[PDB]
Ligand binder design. Structure first.
Ligand SMILES: CC(C)CCC[C@@H](C)[C@H]1CC[C@H]2[C@@H]3CC=C4C[C@@H](O)CC[C@]4(C)[C@H]3CC[C@]12C
Ligand SMILES: CC(C)CCC[C@@H](C)[C@H]1CC[C@H]2[C@@H]3CC=C4C[C@@H](O)CC[C@]4(C)[C@H]3CC[C@]12C
Ligand SMILES: CC(C)CCC[C@@H](C)[C@H]1CC[C@H]2[C@@H]3CC=C4C[C@@H](O)CC[C@]4(C)[C@H]3CC[C@]12C
Ligand SMILES: CC(C)CCC[C@@H](C)[C@H]1CC[C@H]2[C@@H]3CC=C4C[C@@H](O)CC[C@]4(C)[C@H]3CC[C@]12C
Ligand SMILES: CC(C)CCC[C@@H](C)[C@H]1CC[C@H]2[C@@H]3CC=C4C[C@@H](O)CC[C@]4(C)[C@H]3CC[C@]12C
Ligand SMILES: CC(C)CCC[C@@H](C)[C@H]1CC[C@H]2[C@@H]3CC=C4C[C@@H](O)CC[C@]4(C)[C@H]3CC[C@]12C
Ligand SMILES: CC(C)CCC[C@@H](C)[C@H]1CC[C@H]2[C@@H]3CC=C4C[C@@H](O)CC[C@]4(C)[C@H]3CC[C@]12C
Length: 566
């Protein structure tokens, strides 16, 4: 029904493929600054102002509800106040104000022009078109209110750095207001409002085509420039920097969306509860948008804490996408029939599987071209990577052959679950290898025996499950292919693997990092299995468990890519 979600994934792929192409183009010393600077000038001075002006001429203020605006603005203000007061309380008075001048802006100003707008357009085109007009009401008005406080704090920092007592508060406030008014967004929004008042909701044809041509390329050009502006800005930092960065990113992506949603339910008191639900979903989706590079521009202008802000913007840009996907899907689950839940879990499984598959072949190609697998413990890691690649490929093939052929279906199921159980064991097997390496014992490692074990017990388990189990082909999900017996064998496999990892627990640090991260997902799957078997009656909690289990099962390659990929 409402909230057509199938269009979200292609939009995310488009929006990140453009950024990736821009990044790699600059990376390979192909594009130089000259045209890149020209591209940035075109985006900032011509394309974005044209888009704002054309979308601001046609607004139809007479039927625009302001409850959403109040909710979003006050929630942003609440996060702003919380972060600002915490920064004032915590930061050392040496340069505390500087922090308070930029840090709370990081959690409030988003990239809702270049990134968020395509996403909401894909999500809300044929369902709620009017939501699209809210972005241009939310992004500038916030810049009206919250950011001038940041500028005046930065100016206080600059003044105390200069130690010039002659300057009064009037000068500082004036400089801050001059800085905030100088931005193109402010005065172009004002000009748009003035022209909307003047022309009585009419667009000149002589310039309408010019405005459309200038504004249509803005999204892509801005995405390409953003990709170009991330080539060499991420650098190693200290532990305190890492901690404060994690807190900032969690404030942006975890606190603000929840406050926005809750205040949306609080303020709004209209009927037709479906529209209230849609507004809440839209507010939460708007909360999770990334951080715009405008804050990085401000920091560079002020020449203070530039590297922290830049690195945070870069990292949050990438972190936004998976959170966006999982958030959209999990909010969409409650208003769905169980069979659509099965189809949805198949869709998310296929999507994560293809992306993780690309990551996995990239990592495997790097590893094989390294020729570093011939010594311990890299060959076992290669085996695990191959098992993950095969499970992803089997997931895609199973998605295609869910109701295509019979013998093909059983062979695909056998291959997929043999690879799945192979990864389940190979976690604990790597744990054993690491533990025996910890012993520092000059004893030969049965490499042939250990590999044949790791690749032979899972196949034997699947085979005995097939022999003893009963075929049940009416279940969409692959877990319920055979029934209780498959759940029992998966549960005992998980329990054995977790026991092995717990008893057990040269780049050993990365290996132990992987041999710690995989096991949280191991407990997740085990808990889901025992939840299903013990709780025969369905409670209102296993849906998120199923979604998380599917995510881990088919995207576990991302952990290996992150650790053993650079
Ligand atoms: C970095 C590069 C190599 C990534 C390439 C990703 C490609 C192969 C991915 C990204 C989006 C994907 C598509 C997303 C959705 C669908 C609809 C589905 O019903 C059939 C598969 C199909 C049509 C996918 C085919 C593969 C696809 C085009
Ligand atoms: C539903 C899930 C998958 C959504 C995403 C959650 C996870 C993957 C996200 C949420 C916050 C993220 C962290 C935020 C900040 C940092 C600090 C940076 O210096 C390294 C990455 C790191 C440590 C991120 C790793 C990935 C992370 C833990
Ligand atoms: C499919 C969903 C659920 C998960 C997607 C995988 C996520 C969690 C992974 C895939 C690649 C990962 C990134 C790989 C490399 C880096 C650079 C590092 O300096 C900081 C962390 C960061 C930025 C990682 C953050 C987490 C990350 C984005
Ligand atoms: C997860 C689904 C739903 C959305 C798609 C997200 C994709 C496009 C994202 C998730 C994590 C991202 C990666 C995170 C970190 C890095 C390292 C950096 O040096 C190059 C880009 C690269 C390799 C990113 C490429 C794009 C990426 C793979
Ligand atoms: C019917 C109503 C009440 C359902 C409400 C579901 C809420 C509580 C769920 C749905 C989506 C969820 C989010 C999905 C993904 C992430 C990213 C993770 O790194 C931190 C938690 C966070 C941010 C979740 C917080 C809780 C969340 C907002
Ligand atoms: C499809 C999804 C998973 C995105 C995949 C992105 C990852 C796997 C790949 C795609 C293109 C890759 C980049 C291609 C070229 C280079 C230049 C080289 O000198 C360093 C590595 C670097 C910078 C690669 C990093 C990893 C990379 C970003
Ligand atoms: C499906 C979802 C839940 C997968 C989430 C994967 C997360 C936990 C993974 C993916 C990429 C990983 C990062 C990759 C690289 C590094 C650099 C290393 O020096 C410290 C760990 C760190 C920072 C990893 C932390 C964990 C990490 C963020």
């Amino acid at each position: 029904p409402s909230m057509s979600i199938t269009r979200l994934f292609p939009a995310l792929l488009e929006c990140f493929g453009i950024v990736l192409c821009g990044y790699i183009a600059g990376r390979a010393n192909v594009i130089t600054s000259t045209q890149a600077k020209g591209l940035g000038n075109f985006v900032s001075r011509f394309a974005l102002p044209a888009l704002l002006f054309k979308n601001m001429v046609v607004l139809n203020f007479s039927n625009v509800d302001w409850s959403f605006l109040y909710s979003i603005l006050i929630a942003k203000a609440s996060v702003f106040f919380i972060v600002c007061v915490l920064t004032l309380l915590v930061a050392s008075p040496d340069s505390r104000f500087s922090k308070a001048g930029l840090f709370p802006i990081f959690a409030t100003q988003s990239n809702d022009f270049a990134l968020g707008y395509p996403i909401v357009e894909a999500l809300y085109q044929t369902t709620y078109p009017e939501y699209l007009q809210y972005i241009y009401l939310v992004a500038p008005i916030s810049l009206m209110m919250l950011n001038p406080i940041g500028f005046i704090f930065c100016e206080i920092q600059k003044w105390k750095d200069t130690q010039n007592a002659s300057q009064n508060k009037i000068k500082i406030v004036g400089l801050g207001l001059l800085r905030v008014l100088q931005n193109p967004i402010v005065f172009m929004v004002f000009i748009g409002i003035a022209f909307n008042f003047i022309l009585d909701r009419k667009v000149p044809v002589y310039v309408e085509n010019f405005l459309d041509g200038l504004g249509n390329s803005f999204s892509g050009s801005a995405l390409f420039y953003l990709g170009l502006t991330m080539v060499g800005k991420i650098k190693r930092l200290k532990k305190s920097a890492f901690v404060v960065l994690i807190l900032l990113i969690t404030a942006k992506l975890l606190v603000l969306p929840l406050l926005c949603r809750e205040m949306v339910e609080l303020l709004d008191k209209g009927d037709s509860v479906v529209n209230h639900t849609s507004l809440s979903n839209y507010a939460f989706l708007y909360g999770v948008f990334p951080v715009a590079p405008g804050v990085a521009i401000f920091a560079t202008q002020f020449n203070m804490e530039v590297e922290i802000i830049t690195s945070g913007m870069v990292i949050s840009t990438f972190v936004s996408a998976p959170i966006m996907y999982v958030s959209a899907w999990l909010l969409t689950f409650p208003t769905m029939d169980p069979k659509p839940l099965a189809y949805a879990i198949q869709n998310v499984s296929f999507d994560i599987s293809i992306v993780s598959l690309i990551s996995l072949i990239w990592s495997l190609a790097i590893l094989l071209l390294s020729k570093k697998y011939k010594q311990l413990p890299h060959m076992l890691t290669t085996n695990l990577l191959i098992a993950q690649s095969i499970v992803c490929a089997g997931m895609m093939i199973w998605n295609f052959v869910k109701e295509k052929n019979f013998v093909g279906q059983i062979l695909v199921f056998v291959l997929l679950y043999s690879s799945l159980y192979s990864t389940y064991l190979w976690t604990g097997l790597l744990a054993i290898s690491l533990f025996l390496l910890k012993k520092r014992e000059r004893v030969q490692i049965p490499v042939g025996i250990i590999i044949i074990s790791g690749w032979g017990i899972p196949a034997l388990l699947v085979g005995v499950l097939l022999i003893t189990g009963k075929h049940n082909g009416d279940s969409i999900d692959s877990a319920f292919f055979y029934g209780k017996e498959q759940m029992i064998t998966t549960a005992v496999t998980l329990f054995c693997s977790i026991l092995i990892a717990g008893i057990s627990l040269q780049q050993l640090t990365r290996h132990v990092l992987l041999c710690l991260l995989l096991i949280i997902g191991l407990f997740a799957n085990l808990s889901s299995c025992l939840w299903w078997l013990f709780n025969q009656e369905p409670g209102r909690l296993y849906v998120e468990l199923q979604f998380f289990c599917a995510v881990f099962n088919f995207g576990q390659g991302f952990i290996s890519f992150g650790i053993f990929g650079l």
